[PDB]
C-alpha cells in the first residue's frame, strides 16, 4: 500500500495478510521485557502511519482493523478496503480471448 | 529392550542352573565370560560325577573371551556335554568341539560355522606386525586344537576354515565336530506306491 | 502377567524374533519338558517376523521335547510364527477366525568379498530347500506348488488355511 | 515471433506456486503453448491450463493429477480457525480456474477435490484440461513450430557472426 | 550457416572455457552420465531443442547410468524417463539418432537404448542391460490413496511394456515376465531379444572364453565316502 | 594443481593443458561421477586426431561398474593407448594398468605400490534376488580374471587362486609377472 | 497399577502394538480362569494403533463365556472405538464428555510394485472386515458405515447412543 | 510418602498432564468412592498444562464421585488446572494465598489432508465451546464475559479470583495475598 | 629452469611422500628444496629427494621423522599380508634416506622406531640438509 496511489498492481488470486509483528527469543529481566515492548509499540505506530496515508483512515482505525489479529485479505475486497487499486497491466483471460475469437 | 523380560529370563536360567544347565549368552565378550566361568565352577558342589549340559548358541564374539571358557571345560572333574541349538559361530563351535569325546550331542537342524577368528590392528608400523602375529598365533591354536578334536590333518583345517564354512550336523558327524545327534524316533509314514 | 501362566506351560512368542528374544523362548522350553514329559505344552503366536537362524531355533527345540505340543496363532504371523504354527503335531493346530497368516521367504545378509556373497547365497539356498521339505510334511502338499507359494507375499485367511494343511481346527467354528 | 513455449514436468511442489505461473502466462499479449510430459501435479496442472486454448497437448505417457492444497498449521485456537478458512478459499480458487477453463460446472469438480485422483491422457481431453492428444504425428508439428520461431531469432544471430568475422 | 559458428565458438566460447560438456555439445555428442533426476531430464530436453534446429546431421547418444535410483538408496519417480523418450521419438524422421551402450544400463536406461533408430542401436562387448521393476517403494501414507496407487503401478507397467514392445517387436506379456525378477541381459544375446541392432567389436579380440576350463573329470567310485569340502576354485 | 598454466598464449588450467597435449591425469578415486568425465574425454581426443593416449594413474581404489566403463572405451577407440604408473594403483585401479598398451607401453616408477584383488559388491533384500546378484558377481569375477590372464600371459588357474586373497606387487616382481612392460629410469 | 488386577480391571492405554497386545490378552486369560461368572471392566484410552494388534484383542473377548463391560476414558480414535462396539449389548458405557472417533486404520505398503498391490488387498480386506463387523454391532446399514469411515468423524457421547456405539452413559 | 496420603484419601496431581498420568488419578478416585461415599476427598493440583482429551477425564471422574471433593491449588495451574480448580463443590474450594491461576484455551497442531484440517478445526472449536459453557456454571458468570477473559493470556492473582466466582475461600484469612 | 618449492607440512600419509619423491628425480634439471617451519614424514621425503648441495633450511625449522601408520581391520588373512606391507614400506623409506645420509641402514631403523625430531643444528650432521639459510 506504500506505493503510488492509482497504480497498485496485483494478481487476481493472491493472498494479503496484515498482522502485528513478533520478536525473537530474548531472555532478560523485568525491565528487559519493557524495552522490548517499546520496540513493538513503535512497530504498530509506524505501520499504521503508512496505512493511514494509503487507505485514508485515522491512526487508531488502522490499529484496530489491521494490526490487532492475524487476518487475511483476498483480492476483491481489498480494493474496497483500499489496499490495491487495479490488476496487472495487460491482463487478459485465455477464456475471454476465446470469446473474442 | 523390554525390562519386563529380564526377570523372566533370569528365572528360567536359574531353574536350569539347579539342573546343571549353563548358557552361552550372545557374542562372547568379557562380561559374560566371567559370568560363565562362575557357573562351571559352581556346579561341582552337588556332584562331580554326573555330566554337565551346556547350551551353545553364539553368533560371534571376541577371541580371548572364548579361550577363558575353553580351558576350564577340559580341566574340571565332571564331563561337559555341549549342546548346540540354533546357530554356532567360530568361537561357538570351538566351545562345542571342546566337550567330552563321545558326549558332544546336538540336533540335525543347527548350523555349524568355523573360520579363522576376526580381528583388527591399529598403531605404528611395528605395532601392526606385533598384533598380526598374535592373530596368527590365535590362528594356529584354534586350528591346532580342532585338528586334535576332529582327528584330521594340519593342512585340512587351514584349508577349510580359511573363509566362512557352514556345515550341517548330518555332515559334521563325518568331520568330527558333533559326536551324535539327538532326535526322537518318528513313526513310519505310509508313502505312495 | 506372563509369569502367572508360565507354570501351566504357556509360551508367548511376542515381538520380533531376535538373538536374545528367541533365546528366552528356547531356554524356557527346556524347563517345561524336564519337569513333566506327559502333559501338553501350549505355545501362543503373535509376531511380525524375525531372523532366519533365530526363528529356526524355536522349531527344532519344540521337536526336542517328548511331550505333546499345542500351537495357537494370535493376530499376524509373518514367515516365522506361521512356519512355527504348523510345526506342531496334527489335530492340535487351532487358529482364530480373524488371524492373518502370512507366507513369505526369509531374508539374508552379506557384506564382505564377492566369494563371501556366494557363500551366503548357498547358505540361504540351503535354508530355502530345508523349510520347503518341512512345510510339505505336515501339509501333504507337493514340492511344486509349495515353492511358488513362498515366492510372493500372500496373506491367507484361516478359511483356506484349513484345506491347505497348515492349521487343523478353528476356535469358535465360524 | 512472440510465442512462448514452456515444457511441463513436475511431480510435486506447493499449490501456491502453480497459481503464480498460471497468471504469469495469462497477462502475456501473445499466445502460449504448454506441453505436458511425465506427470502434471497440482503445481503443474495449473501451468498446463494457463496456456492458450487450442495449443495444449498431453502425451500418452503423461498423467494429470489434481491435488488438494497441502499446508502446515501451528498456533493458538484463535489462529487455527483463520488459516483453515484460507484452505477453503484456495479450494474455492483452484475449483474456479478449473471451472472457467474446462467447460465444467463447479459442483462436479468440487466432488473431485475431496479425494486425490490421477488422470490419464484420455480423461484429460474429456474433462477439458487439454485440447489434443500429443501423439507421434502431432509432435512433428511441435518440432516445426519451434523451428520457425527460433530461426527468427537465429537469423539475427547469423548476421552478427558474419559481421564480426 | 552454423558451421562457421562451430569454428568460431571453439576459438572463443568453447575452447578456452575448460568445461568438457561444452566441447562435447558442439560435436553433436549428447552423453547421459549422471543419474536421472529433476535436473537431468530438463537438461536433456533443453539440449534436444537446440540439436534439432541447426542441421539434420546425425547425433550421437551415449548411455552410461544406473537409471534413476540405485536399489540401495532413496527412490523417486519413473515418469521422467518417458518424457525424454517421447521427446527423442519424434526426432527419428527429422534427424538420425545413433545410440551406443557404454558401461552399464540399469532399468530405465535400457528404455532409451531401444529408443534409437533401427539399424543404429549398438552396445559394447561387456555391457549390462537390466530389466528392473520400478519404482516408489514408499507407501506409508493414508490408506484412502493406495487404491489409486494400485492403478498407477498397473498402468505404468502397461505403458512401459507398450513402449518396449514397439521397439523390440515382441509380445507385451513377455515384458512382464522379465519384470518379476531383475534378470540381467548379455548384449551378445540381446540382438535376438530385439533391444539392440548390433554389437560393435574392438579391432583386436583378446577376450578368451572360459569353456576350456572343463577338463572332463572322471566319475568317482561308488565305494568311496567323499568329503564335504566346499567348492572353491 | 590449483594454479593454472599456459598452452601457447593464454591462461589454461593444468589438467586441460595436458588434454591438448594428449596426456590424461587421474588423481582421485574411480567413482561414478569422475568416470563420466573420463570416458567423455577419451571420445573427444579420438575425434580430433589418432595418436597414442597417455594415462597417469593415482587411484587408491574404487567401484567395479564405473571402472569397466573406462576399460571398454580403451578397446572401442581406433587410436592407441599407453598406461604409465606413478604413485600407487590399488584395487580396480591396478586393473586399468593392464587395460591397453600391451606391446611395450606399460611404464611404472621404481617405487610404485601395486595391488591386485578380486572385486566385490553388496546388495541385500529378497532371497530370490540374492541368487541373481550372486551370479552377477561370479560372472564379474572370472571375466576380470580372464582379461588379466591374456594381458599378462599368466595361466588362468593361477589368477583365481592368487588374486582371491590379498596380493601386493613391487616393480621388481611386476616385470617377471608381465603386469608392466618397462620401468622408468631417472631421466 | 497393580490394585486394578485384583478388582478385575485391565487398562488399555496408549497406542496398541505387539507387546501391549500380548500383555492385554495375558490378563484376559487369568481373569476368566479365576471366575467365569463375574464381568471384566476395561478402561479404553487409545489414539490408534496397528491393524493386527487391535484385531488380536477383539477375538479373545468373544471367547470369554461371561460378558464384558467397556468404559470409554477420554478418547478412542479409530482403534479403541472398535473395542467399545464389540462389547456386550447393555454393557457399553462411556463418559458423558468423552469422544468417539471412527476412521479407517493406518498402515503402510513397503516393497515391490507387485508387493504393494498384493498387500493393499489385505488393507482392502481389512476395511471390509472392520466395516463388516461394525455394521452388525450398531444395527445400521452397510452403506452408512462405509460412507463415514474414510474421513475422521468425531462423535459425541449423546449421539453415540442413537447411532449404536455405546448403550448407556454413567452420569450419577 | 504418597501412600500415607492415599489411606487418608488425599491424592496429588503434579507435573504435566499426560495420557499415562490421567488414568492413574481416575483409578484411585473410584477406589475412594467405593470405600467411603461420605468422606470427602482432598486433591492437590500443580500442573503447567496438559491435553484437552485426557484433562476432561479428570473432570468426569470428579463428577462420577458421589462423595464431595475438595481442591487445593499450589504452585501452578495453567490452562488445565484452573479448569479443575473451580470444578469441585462450591464452598469447599481452597488454595494457597499466592498461587497463580491461568485461564486460557488449550493448544493443538493440525496437518494432513484438506478435509482432515476442517475436521480438527471445528473439533478444537467444539472443545473451546464446551470448555466455556462448563466453566460458566459454577462461576455464576455470563457466557459473553467468560468467553473473552479466556482469550487473554494473562495470569490471575487469587485476590480477584474470589469475586470472579472461580474460588470460594483462601487459606490465610485473605490478608497474605500480595498483588 | 630450476624448480623452487616451499616445503611446509605437519601431517599426511607417507604414501603421498613417495609420489612427490619420484616426481622430483623425474626432472632432468636440479631442484632447490627450502623447508620452512614444520617438516613431517611426507615432507622430509621431498626434502631428502632434492639435489645434493641445494637443500636449504632455516634456524627455526624442524624435521619430523617417524615410521608409517595405517588402519587395519577385517579377516585374519589379509592382516598378515598387509603387515608385510607396512614393514617393507618402512624398509623402503629407510633406503630412500640412506642414499643421501651415507649411513648404515641398521641405525636408521632404530631412529624410525619412535618419533624423531631434529633442530637446525643436527639436521646438517644427519645429512637431511646442506647449510643454514
Curated annotation (Swiss-Prot), chain D:
Signal peptide: none annotated. The active site is at residues 42, 67. It comes from the Eukaryota. It is found in: Plastid, Chloroplast stroma. Cleaves peptides in various proteins in a process that requires ATP hydrolysis. Has a chymotrypsin-like activity. Plays a major role in the degradation of misfolded proteins. Belongs to the peptidase S14 family. This gene contains one large insertion sequence (IS1) that divides the clpP gene into two sequence domains. The insertion sequence forms a continuous open reading frame with its upstream and downstream sequence domains. Component of the chloroplastic Clp protease core complex. This is ATP-dependent Clp protease proteolytic subunit. The lineage of its organism: Eukaryota, Viridiplantae, Chlorophyta, core chlorophytes, Chlorophyceae.
Swiss-Prot record, chain I:
Disulfide bonds: none annotated. It is found in: Plastid, Chloroplast stroma. The active site is at residues 41, 66. This gene contains one large insertion sequence (IS1) that divides the clpP gene into two sequence domains. The insertion sequence forms a continuous open reading frame with its upstream and downstream sequence domains. Belongs to the peptidase S14 family. Component of the chloroplastic Clp protease core complex. This is ATP-dependent Clp protease proteolytic subunit. It comes from Chlamydomonas reinhardtii (Chlamydomonas smithii). The chain holds residues 347 to 479 of 524 of the full protein.
Amino acid at each position: 500500500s506504500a506505493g503510488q496511489k492509482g497504480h497498485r498492481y496485483s494478481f487476481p488470486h493472491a493472498k494479503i495478510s496484515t498482522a502485528p509483528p513478533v520478536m525473537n527469543r530474548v531472555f532478560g529481566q523485568a525491565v528487559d521485557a519493557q524495552l522490548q515492548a517499546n520496540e513493538l509499540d513503535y512497530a504498530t505506530k509506524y505501520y499504521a502511519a503508512i496505512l493511514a496515508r494509503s487507505t485514508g483512515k485515522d491512526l487508531e482505525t488502522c490499529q484496530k482493523q489491521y494490526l490487532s489479529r492475524k487476518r487475511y485479505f483476498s483480492v476483491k475486497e481489498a480494493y474496497e478496503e483500499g489496499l490495491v487499486d487495479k490488476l496487472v497491466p495487460g491482463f487478459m483471460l485465455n477464456r475471454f480471448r476465446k470469446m473474442q475469437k | 529392550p523390554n525390562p519386563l523380560v529380564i526377570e523372566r529370563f533370569q528365572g528360567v536360567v536359574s531353574q536350569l542352573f539347579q539342573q546343571r544347565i549353563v548358557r552361552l549368552g550372545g557374542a562372547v565378550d568379557d562380561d559374560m565370560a566371567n559370568l560363565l566361568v562362575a557357573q562351571l565352577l559352581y556346579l561341582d558342589s552337588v556332584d562331580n560325577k554326573r555330566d554337565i549340559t551346556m547350551y551353545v548358541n553364539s553368533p560371534g564374539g571376541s577371541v580371548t573371551a572364548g579361550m577363558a571358557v575353553f580351558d576350564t571345560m577340559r580341566h574340571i572333574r565332571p564331563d561337559v556335554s555341549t549342546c548346540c541349538i540354533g546357530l554356532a559361530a567360530s568361537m561357538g563351535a570351538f566351545i562345542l568341539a571342546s566337550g567330552q569325546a563321545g558326549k558332544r550331542y546336538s540336533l540335525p537342524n543347527s548350523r555349524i560355522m568355523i573360520h579363522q577368528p576376526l580381528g583388527g590392528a591399529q598403531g605404528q608400523a611395528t605395532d601392526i606386525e606385533i598384533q598380526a602375529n598374535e592373530i596368527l598365533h590365535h590362528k594356529l591354536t584354534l586350528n591346532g586344537y580342532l585338528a586334535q578334536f576332529t582327528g584330521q590333518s594340519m593342512e585340512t583345517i587351514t584349508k577349510d576354515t580359511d573363509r566362512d564354512f557352514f556345515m550341517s550336523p548330518q555332515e559334521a558327524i563325518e568331520y568330527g565336530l558333533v559326536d551324535a545327534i539327538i532326535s526322537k524316533p518318528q513313526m513310519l509314514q505310509s508313502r505312495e506306491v | 502377567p506372563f509369569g502367572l501362566l508360565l507354570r501351566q506351560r504357556i509360551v508367548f512368542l511376542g515381538g520380533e524374533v531376535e538373538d536374545f528374544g528367541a533365546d528366552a523362548i528356547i531356554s524356557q522350553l527346556l524347563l517345561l519338558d524336564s519337569q513333566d514329559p506327559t502333559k501338553d505344552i501350549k505355545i501362543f503366536i503373535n509376531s511380525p517376523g524375525g531372523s532366519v537362524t533365530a526363528g529356526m531355533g524355536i522349531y527344532d527345540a519344540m521337536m526336542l521335547c517328548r511331550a505333546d505340543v499345542n500351537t495357537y496363532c494370535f493376530g499376524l504371523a509373518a514367515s516365522m510364527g506361521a512356519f512355527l504354527l504348523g510345526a506342531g503335531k496334527r489335530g492340535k493346530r487351532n487358529s482364530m477366525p480373524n488371524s492373518r497368516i502370512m507366507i513369505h521367504q526369509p531374508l539374508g545378509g552379506a557384506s564382505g568379498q564377492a566369494v563371501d556373497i556366494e557363500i551366503q547365497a548357498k547358505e540361504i539356498m540351503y535354508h530355502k530347500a530345508n523349510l520347503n521339505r518341512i512345510m510339505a510334511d505336515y501339509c501333504q502338499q507337493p514340492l511344486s506348488k509349495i515353492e511358488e507359494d513362498t515366492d510372493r507375499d500372500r496373506y491367507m485367511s484361516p478359511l483356506e488355511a484349513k484345506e491347505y494343511g497348515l492349521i487343523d481346527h478353528i476356535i469358535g467354528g465360524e | 515471433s512472440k510465442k512462448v513455449f514452456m515444457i511441463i514436468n513436475s511431480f510435486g511442489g506447493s499449490v501456491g506456486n502453480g497459481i503464480t505461473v498460471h497468471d504469469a502466462l495469462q497477462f502475456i499479449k501473445a499466445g502460449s503453448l504448454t506441453l505436458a510430459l511425465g506427470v502434471a501435479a497440482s503445481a503443474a496442472s495449473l501451468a498446463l491450463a494457463g496456456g492458450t486454448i487450442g495449443e495444449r497437448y498431453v502425451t500418452e505417457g503423461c498423467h494429470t493429477m489434481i491435488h488438494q492444497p497441502e499446508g502446515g498449521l501451528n498456533g493458538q485456537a484463535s489462529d487455527i480457525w483463520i488459516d483453515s478458512q484460507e484452505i477453503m478459499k484456495i479450494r474455492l480458487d483452484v475449483a474456479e480456474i478449473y471451472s472457467l477453463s474446462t467447460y465444467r460446472p463447479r459442483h462436479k469438480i468440487l466432488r473431485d477435490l475431496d479425494r486425490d485422483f490421477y488422470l490419464t491422457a484420455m480423461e484429460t481431453i474429456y474433462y477439458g484440461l487439454a485440447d489434443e492428444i500429443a501423439t507421434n504425428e502431432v509432435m512433428h508439428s511441435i518440432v516445426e513450430m519451434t523451428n520457425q520461431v527460433w530461426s527468427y531469432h537465429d537469423s539475427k544471430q547469423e548476421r552478427l557472426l558474419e559481421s564480426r568475422a | 550457416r552454423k558451421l562457421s559458428h562451430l569454428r568460431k565458438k571453439l576459438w572463443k566460447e568453447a575452447g578456452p572455457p575448460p568445461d568438457l560438456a561444452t566441447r562435447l555439445f558442439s560435436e553433436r555428442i549428447m552423453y547421459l552420465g549422471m543419474p536421472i533426476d529433476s535436473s537431468v531430464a530438463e537438461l536433456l530436453t533443453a539440449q534436444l531443442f537446440v540439436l534439432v534446429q541447426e542441421a539434420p546431421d546425425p547425433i550421437f547418444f551415449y548411455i552410461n547410468s544406473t537409471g534413476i535410483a540405485k536399489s540401495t538408496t532413496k527412490f523417486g519417480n519413473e515418469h521422467e524417463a518417458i518424457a525424454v523418450y517421447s521427446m527423442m521419438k519424434g526426432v527419428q524422421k527429422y534427424c538420425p539418432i545413433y545410440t551406443l551402450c557404454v558401461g552399464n544400463a540399469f532399468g530405465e536406461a535400457a528404455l532409451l537404448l531401444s529408443a534409437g533408430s533401427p539399424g543404429k542401436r549398438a552396445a559394447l562387448r561387456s555391457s549390462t542391460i537390466m530389466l528392473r521393476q520400478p519404482l516408489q517403494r514408499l507407501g506409508g501414507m493414508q490408506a484412502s490413496d493406495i487404491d489409486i496407487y494400485r492403478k498407477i503401478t498397473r498402468e505404468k507397467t502397461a505403458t512401459m511394456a507398450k513402449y518396449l514392445a514397439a521397439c523390440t517387436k515382441k509380445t507385451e506379456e513377455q515384458i512382464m515376465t522379465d519384470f518379476t525378477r531383475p534378470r540381467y541381459f548379455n548384449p551378445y544375446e540381446a540382438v535376438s531379444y530385439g533391444l539392440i541392432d548390433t554389437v560393435l567389436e574392438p579391432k583386436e579380440e583378446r577376450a578368451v572364453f572360459k569353456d576350456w576350463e572343463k577338463m572332463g573329470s572322471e566319475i568317482a567310485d561308488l565305494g568311496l565316502w567323499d568329503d564335504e569340502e566346499q567348492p572353491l576354485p | 594443481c590449483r594454479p593454472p598454466g599456459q598452452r601457447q598464449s593464454e591462461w589454461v588450467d593444468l589438467w586441460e593443458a595436458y588434454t591438448y597435449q594428449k596426456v590424461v591425469f587421474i588423481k582421485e578415486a574411480i567413482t561414478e561421477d569422475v568416470a563420466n568425465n573420463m570416458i567423455a574425454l577419451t571420445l573427444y581426443l579420438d575425434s580430433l586426431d589418432q595418436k597414442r593416449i597417455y594415462y597417469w594413474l593415482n587411484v587408491p581404489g574404487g567401484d567395479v561398474v564405473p571402472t569397466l566403463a573406462l576399460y571398454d572405451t580403451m578397446q572401442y577407440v581406433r587410436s592407441k593407448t599407453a598406461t604409465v604408473c606413478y604413485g600407487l594403483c590399488l584395487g580396480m585401479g591396478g586393473f586399468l594398468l593392464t587395460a591397453g598398451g600391451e606391446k611395450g607401453y606399460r611404464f611404472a616408477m621404481p617405487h610404485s605400490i601395486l595391488m591386485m584383488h578380486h572385486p566385490s559388491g553388496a546388495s541385500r533384500g529378497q532371497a530370490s534376488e540374492m541368487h541373481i546378484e550372486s551370479r552377477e558377481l561370479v560372472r564379474m569375477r572370472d571375466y576380470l580374471s580372464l582379461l588379466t590372464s591374456n594381458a599378462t600371459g599368466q595361466p588362468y588357474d593361477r589368477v583365481i587362486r592368487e588374486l582371491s586373497r590379498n596380493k601386493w606387487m613391487d616393480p621388481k616382481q611386476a616385470i617377471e609377472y608381465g603386469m608392466i612392460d618397462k620401468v622408468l629410469t631417472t631421466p
